[PDB]
Design a protein around this ligand. Structure first.
Ligand SMILES: O=C(O)c1c(O)cccc1O
Ligand SMILES: O=C(O)c1c(O)cccc1O
Ligand SMILES: O=C(O)c1c(O)cccc1O
Ligand SMILES: O=C(O)c1c(O)cccc1O
Ligand SMILES: [Zn+2]
Ligand SMILES: [Zn+2]
Ligand SMILES: [Zn+2]
Ligand SMILES: [Zn+2]
Lengths: 321, 324, 324, 325
């Protein structure tokens, strides 16, 4: 398939590069993160990707406790990104990196990126760290409501990307570093953060918000029925502040991408849960090979009409292209 | 469908009853359900095509008793009670053992006692154990539990790894959201990861004949299993965990999942295309779930009639050697 | 779900009533007749009780397609269409109409479609397969040359054409000899209709009129499941197909066809169709009065698909297709 | 996947070679002929390169079923079976065989089946639909009374019966008039075979002989997708069906049939079948030489199913069905 849109495609700046064992692989990953116009573009051309919505790597800004430096790095990353997109505006779009450890500053940088730089959304690597940085700051908290109101005003999607939990909140993985990251930890962290947003009633207050989750929903689709329907015989209203069910907000305010989850069975389950209209193609480059994502998607077992929507038209619609 | 086998069916004894809402008329009903075995439960089984019910103590129960002596005491009592209840109707009730795993040796002894002397057909443990001050979750992939697993394999009976909530110090991500703890989500995360720890530790290389059972359709594992092994596939460097093979291998070869508290056809279809119908078992999670809810859904779920028979009955019959 | 649109919903006029006599046992004949003749009363109460806002009505089968005499066919067609317009006018907020066409006379059929659409406001046409004319011994399929002008007018008026089933003529039914239970909805209807659809595709009709919209009931008359094979059988033979059409069957099916759930309330079938043609091209329908409205609605309300798709298949796809 | 078993794999003898002539263009005819006559070379090399350990061979179509003279049919069947036995004996660790039967003569077909199974070690029979006999103008379906003795023997011998396709006779093909491209594997084959199978079910054959194992290729010739409708159409009519069989079509399909992936390398189709008849009754097959072995194998090795089912469908279901363990 040609003319695809991919939106979990990362890059890095020298300042955040270290955020991502010794050898040829680490060397290649660094080159990939810093490259935009050469290797990346050539692969896009060879693998039917017309539009790539770029985002800074992780955890990047979310792991910078000093709000002052966080704002500085965010602005720096966004300016570099703007410069890179300007070189091939027909191929590259961008997500804003935000210094959410400072709500007001984050709201202001998002406005700058959207109104001044033409960015089409924001991508945040989970909870923020601030001050001593020992407390994970989730976005369902009161201090972030103004920010969400502005996100809804600008009407641009918010991509809730993964990050690892803090060491003190990772005991379950002690002795198992291989379970952290993309293997599992990433999904758990992001799925719950997403659930917190839903449970908080955020989408009752701002129903037009568009949240995006990669890796096919971080496991949410398969368990969505249980999330709401467990112990169904208990006919008492849910205790959380949100007015409706998790499935309602997930179906109405979320979109999921195929980033790093090239599995047909998983895609079928998702199509039968959230629907093809809310699934978007993405690769997770440079952490995943573009050819791997594209070859799989070009041949996955779905209707051709859905391959067109998932690979291109859903995104073009979502980002008003 | 008639003649079904259900195996995540709970009961409680006065000592563990409190572990199991609000002041609402629901708490009263739940209590009655947990304490009942021969009456209400049996009538529902007769009304909903369930011939065999493999009973297990509630949660967290024994896993939440930090004092070894006490844990060993409560477990033995819960197992003696269970043994007595099953003896009243051996043609309908089977049993899973409650184990005081905060004491590896005592747990091994009690499992042997239950299996060899009481005829229990397996064990059901509610996640990690608490011991001493009870501030450290004790996972079963740890070295001290290897002798135990060797005995489990020797006795050749399944181990049902059931959920429990993580300790508060390990649940900050849920702070302010108590509604996310329990069956809503926390149970799955806790159990899925414990299962992965067992896999990564190489436990199944050492004891390949082990049979582990997970409820709630695998605690989310099937949907993400491909990613668990294949994420960042371009990096051809070998994984550094002790296990010799991949997660999917151990999941496909040493695990079975049940339909407990997850009556969703889409989820069942995904599981069928991931682990296979031969590895899926009907279960309800009674009394936390209504038996009629579980049965009505399963009787009509969109699968092959041949698979409805296997998932609803024959897979469990074979697994627990009920035909011979 | 409320506000659904159903479009394979039949009625009959005295002149065509007997055509449905041989499709149900004698004990059910009186009831089927009542249903076929009723539009304003019981039918509407069933619609209200089962969340159906719009019902696009059509004459029963084979009706006009089984009238060998051109003059008579044109007469009955106009009559049925006039009656249908009368009934819709009684409840214009709930009923829409498909035209009955005397296709044994191409020109007359073209004229009648124009009258129905431009003058009566009908939203499409429903034809029960091939037509009989003259001695009525030869099935007349619509891929034939003489029907090209008609198709050009269908595309110009831009209204869908519902290719409905009918049984094959006796001389073309020997495979069912001794098995009358295989004729009709059991199987013969699907074969007859699926092949007729393939004939239209293979003839290149959609190359000439790419904007045509064809609708098939009973989930595509079996087409989705075998569509890959229809084009890809013997793929090693790298030569172009021998038929007139310039492209593949899958292209025309994917681009010019829509299928409904009439008389095929099977979740597995719906899932296969979703993964072959997509939810955007599947429409809810019941096949009342040959199928119970509650059977269709109850199944569709609970089938295992995304809620977003239940809304599309149940309502918005049809509203989009018929420009409502 | 290695060690696969494939069971809709054809070959031909000079006497039946021309039967496959019209099914392929002119330039590809030479290649197809080579493939049909080859068993020990090209075929074996493809099996070794594409993980196929066992190939259950069968004569091409329509072959014997299109020979109206009983005597000639009996001769051709026997000749074809002897050649096949000869070929299998060259590499018995890789090749097994399906008997060709002269069903235009019930008693003769019964005797030949016995000969192939008892004396030649054949593991079943493959018949290309209805038979033609005498004037050959009447399709003879196997649900007819004269074939009951035959079926009784099939059940006694306890070997599967592969109901393979064939095109209907011209007078029974008017729906395809003007569309020769709709005959054969494109569609006519499936319609013809699906209905023949339904006739067997409706006749009550499986009530009388419940241990029969019937096999259909091309993923059930379309049956799985419409199976619910076949039994449940017009469900509001609460009156039993009119056919002589005691139960439902779905019951006989679920209990007496097995389907193969021959010439239908489609994942969506396989998923539907898995949810209708179950993975335990789906078997890998290619339809070589009409389909490329690599096409079938590459698709099956990667299709979206549980690895445990890939093993069953690709090998163990067949080994179990043909008692190879
Ligand atoms: O997608 C990512 O952002 C990512 C990382 O940031 C680190 C490792 C793997 C990975 O997929
Ligand atoms: O053990 C369970 O399965 C359970 C509980 O112990 C408490 C709430 C829900 C539940 O499913
Ligand atoms: O027109 C129909 O839809 C129909 C019949 O005409 C006869 C039986 C069943 C049926 O669905
Ligand atoms: O016998 C077959 O299987 C066959 C043919 O005889 C002709 C074309 C395709 C095909 O699969
Ligand atoms: Zn990423
Ligand atoms: Zn439980
Ligand atoms: Zn109809
Ligand atoms: Zn064949």
């Amino acid at each position: 398939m040609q003319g695809k849109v991919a939106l979990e495609e990362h890059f890095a700046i020298p300042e955040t590069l270290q955020d991502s064992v010794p050898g040829d692989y680490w060397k290649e990953l660094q080159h990939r993160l810093l490259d935009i116009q050469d290797t990346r573009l050539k692969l896009m051309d060879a693998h039917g990707i017309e539009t790539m919505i770029l985002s800074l790597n992780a955890p990047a800004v979310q792991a910078i406790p000093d709000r002052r430096k966080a704002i500085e790095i965010a602005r720096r990353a966004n300016d570099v990104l703007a410069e890179e997109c300007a070189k091939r505006p027909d191929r590259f779009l961008a997500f804003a990196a935000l210094p959410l450890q400072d709500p007001d500053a984050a709201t202001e940088e998002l406005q700058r990126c959207v109104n001044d730089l033409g960015f089409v959304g924001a991508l945040v690597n989970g909870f923020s760290q601030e001050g001593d940085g020992q407390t994970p700051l989730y976005y369902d908290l009161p201090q972030y409501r103004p920010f969400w109101g502005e996100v809804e005003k600008l009407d641009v999607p918010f991509y809730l990307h993964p990050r690892n939990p803090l060491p003190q909140d990772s005991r379950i993985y002690d002795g198992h570093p291989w379970l952290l990251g993309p293997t599992w930890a990433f999904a758990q962290e992001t799925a719950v953060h997403a659930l917190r947003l839903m449970a908080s009633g955020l989408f009752d207050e701002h129903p037009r918000l568009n949240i995006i989750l990669g890796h096919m929903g971080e496991g949410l689709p398969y368990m969505m029925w249980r999330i709401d329907h467990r112990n169904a015989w208990v006919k008492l209203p849910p205790r959380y502040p949100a007015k409706r069910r998790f499935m309602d907000y997930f179906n109405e305010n979320f979109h999921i991408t195929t980033s790093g989850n090239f599995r047909t069975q998983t895609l079928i389950d998702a199509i039968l849960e959230i629907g093809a209209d809310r699934i978007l193609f993405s690769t997770d480059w440079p952490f995943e090979n573009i050819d791997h994502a594209s070859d799989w998607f070009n041949a996955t077992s779905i209707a051709e009409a859905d391959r067109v929507k998932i690979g291109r038209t859903n995104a073009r619609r979502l980002f008003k292209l």
